[PDB]
Amino acid sequence: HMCDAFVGTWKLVSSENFDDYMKEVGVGFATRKVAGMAKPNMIISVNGDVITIKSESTFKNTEISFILGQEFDEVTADDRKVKSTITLDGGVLVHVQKWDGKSTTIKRKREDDKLVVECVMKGVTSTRVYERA
Ligand SMILES: O=C(O)c1csc(Cc2cccc(Cl)c2)n1
């Protein structure tokens, strides 16, 4: 019952600062433009201790499966090869990515009927809001 309130199909309804977040991460111009136009659906499911997060859009379809607190290797939609760990901290899913001596954190929280995604790297934050599909 770990993530019950996150499970479901979610659609992007708003974004702020995502281009600048992507610049900070190191994403190149063409990828930023196409990725920034995407309107992904995020599909979260749980089977036993394994959580699966899928993101589907015209830009890219991604899927990660993981156990909380157990590191895994991830190829991000922008083609970084990162080492990721996802934990629950006070009801917030905290997804940390480490690569090339750098780090970024993606937090996912339930707030009212929304799922709010906050992405941070070195003072650059982006907030992306999803609603149930
Ligand atoms: O709400 C989302 O769609 C989301 C937040 S963070 C992330 C992962 C990422 C970072 C930089 C470039 C790209 Cl294309 C993807 N995807």
What are the structural domains of the chain? Answer: 4-130 (2.40.128.20)
* Any atom of ligand 1 within 6 Å of the Cβ of 121: no
Residue carrying the six token digits 């937090």? 107
Ligand 1 closest atom vs CA 38: 3
Q: How far apart are CA 127 and CA 116, in angstroms?
A: 7
* Resolution in units of Å: 1.0
Q: How far apart are CA 101 and CA 31, in angstroms?
A: 22
Half-sphere exposure of 82 (CA within 13 A, CB side): 22
* Range 76-110 burial, b when 16+ CB lie within 10 A, else e: bbeebebebbbeeeeeebbbbbebeeeebebbbbe
- The verdict on whether residue 92 carries a ligand-binding annotation is no
**Phi, psi dihedrals of residue 100, rounded to the nearest 5°:** 50, 35
Q: How far apart are CA 67 and CA 99, in angstroms?
A: 20
Host H or E run for residue 121 = strand 114-121
Among candidates 98, 95, 101, which has minimal Cα distance to 119? 95
* Any atom of ligand 1 within 6 Å of the Cβ of 25: yes
Half-sphere exposure of 133 (CA within 13 A, CB side): 15
- The verdict on whether residue 108 carries a ligand-binding annotation is no
